Ligand binder design. Structure first.
Ligand SMILES: O=C(O)CC[C@@H](NC(=O)c1cccc(NCc2ccc(/C=C3\SC(=S)NC3=O)cc2)c1)C(=O)O
Length: 435
């Protein structure tokens, strides 16, 4: 693509918006930047040569543009963006710009849960094969910063939002891992609209990898599949042993993995299917499965001390993710479960089946704390903040207990992101969980 001489407007700054600014400048195009936040993240790092408008969108600049580059954090349905689309002004995102330039195959991964873990795993599979791999696409690692003529493979975690503005992806292997209700605040036509955004990932993909146990991951109209009992890649349970299998052949006894639990086992299957389709050697891919230790904020044990395990699962930002942490969970004594934040209009009721019995306490906070408490008011406390919740529950904690942050909500009402929320939990857990 050739951007020379174009009037380019970037909407949304932060690290990703900055990556877009730098992309155009390096190509001899000076873009303009706008952000509805008065002082968005990264403002101080924008060069002074770049004109910017903050605190609102500027329709004069939008309607004059030849190309709009929209952050995934701004809805395409925003009136100012829809007016530009109606006028025939091209709108893309950073991932689109990346796909137009990439000179290595792309493995593309989305889904409501698991997409970071799968993306990181396939990255480790590539490294174990000695392939020069670029891994990113999420908040901390903008895709455009990965671009490098020496890269031999890219592995991208993509959100529904990024996919909405992407049209040139031709993934060597693409997956939707699962679709469970999330981001309803951005999808006013409901679950099927959210699904449709994710289905975009399979367009022009060489291999599609679907979840045999989740029909919403399947194109609406020859995909490779993974599942628990069913699928080209599936699990084989005999004795107390679990195996990863491909078409009936055993490939790995999961005792060799550091990760544990059924959803980690299906994540490993999806990652193997992707790696296989991308041409990576199977034997090195299996090696990577044995060495991978998990991501921070993903059911991460931050302290095990005095008979109590404190678990940071701050990356549980929707109901399906919390349900994965609770489903099959073993607790010797009482589970003290922290819920709260911006629930984005989600139906929390699917959590209710996990919350019966004498050994559960809920500590609910943030924007939607009252609705979370209402799942079972007799075992629930509500506070404004997570720190208040933590200081309220810590005196009640007994040897045998588990304290679990798995909030089912975004952190954005009170924190910069789920990583800051996790880090604060870990700090308080270390404070409160010893003498
Ligand atoms: O961290 C959490 O707790 C939420 C996790 C959960 N994040 C998002 O829903 C999400 C969606 C899109 C973007 C970002 N992260 C970067 C970003 C954050 C805020 C903005 C806000 C903008 S842009 C603009 S113009 N005006 C704004 O307010 C833009 C980009 C986050 C997810 O990954 O599922």
């Amino acid at each position: 693509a050739d951007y020379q001489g174009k009037n380019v407007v970037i909407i949304g700054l932060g690290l990703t918006g900055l990556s877009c600014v730098d992309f155009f400048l390096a190509r001899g195009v000076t873009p303009r930047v706008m952000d509805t936040r008065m002082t968005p993240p990264g403002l101080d790092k924008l060069p002074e040569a770049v004109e910017r408008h903050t605190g609102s969108l500027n329709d004069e600049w939008l309607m004059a543009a030849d190309l709009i580059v929209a952050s995934p954090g701004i809805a395409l349905a925003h009136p100012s963006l829809s007016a530009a689309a109606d006028a025939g002004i091209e709108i893309v995102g950073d991932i689109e710009l990346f796909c137009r330039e990439a000179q290595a195959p792309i493995v593309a991964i989305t889904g409501s849960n698991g997409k970071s873990t799968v993306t990181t795993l396939v990255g480790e599979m590539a490294k174990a094969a000695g392939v020069n791999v670029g891994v990113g696409g999420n908040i901390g690692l903008p895709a455009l910063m990965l671009l490098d003529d020496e890269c031999e493979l890219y592995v991208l975690e993509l959100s529904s939002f990024q996919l909405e503005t992407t049209s040139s992806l031709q993934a060597v292997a693409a997956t939707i891992l699962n679709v469970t209700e999330d981001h309803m605040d951005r999808y006013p036509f409901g679950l099927q609209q959210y699904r449709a955004a994710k289905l975009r990932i399979y367009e022009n993909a060489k291999v599609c990898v679907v979840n045999a146990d989740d029909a919403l991951t399947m194109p609406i109209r020859r995909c490779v599949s993974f599942g628990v009992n069913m699928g080209d890649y599936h699990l084989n349970h005999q004795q107390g042993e679990t195996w990863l299998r491909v078409k009936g052949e055993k490939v790995l006894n999961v005792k060799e993995m550091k990760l544990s639990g059924q959803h980690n086992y299906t994540n490993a299957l999806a990652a193997l299917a992707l790696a296989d389709a991308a041409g990576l050697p199977r034997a090195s891919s299996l090696k990577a499965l044995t060495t991978f230790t998990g991501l921070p904020h993903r059911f991460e044990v931050v302290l095990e001390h005095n008979g109590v395990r404190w678990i940071n699962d701050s990356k549980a930002t929707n109901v399906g993710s919390t349900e994965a942490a609770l489903n099959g969970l073993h607790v010797d004594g009482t589970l003290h479960l922290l819920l709260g934040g911006d629930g984005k209009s989600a139906d929390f009721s699917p959590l209710a089946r996990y919350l019966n019995g004498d050994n559960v306490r809920l500590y609910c906070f943030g924007r939607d704390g009252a609705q979370l408490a209402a799942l079972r008011p007799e075992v629930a406390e509500q506070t404004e903040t997570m720190e208040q919740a933590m200081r309220l529950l810590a005196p009640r904690v007994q040897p045998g207990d588990m304290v679990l942050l798995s909030p089912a909500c975004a952190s954005l009402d009170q924190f910069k992101n789920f990583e800051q929320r996790g880090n604060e939990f870990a700090r308080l857990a270390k404070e409160l969980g010893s003498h």
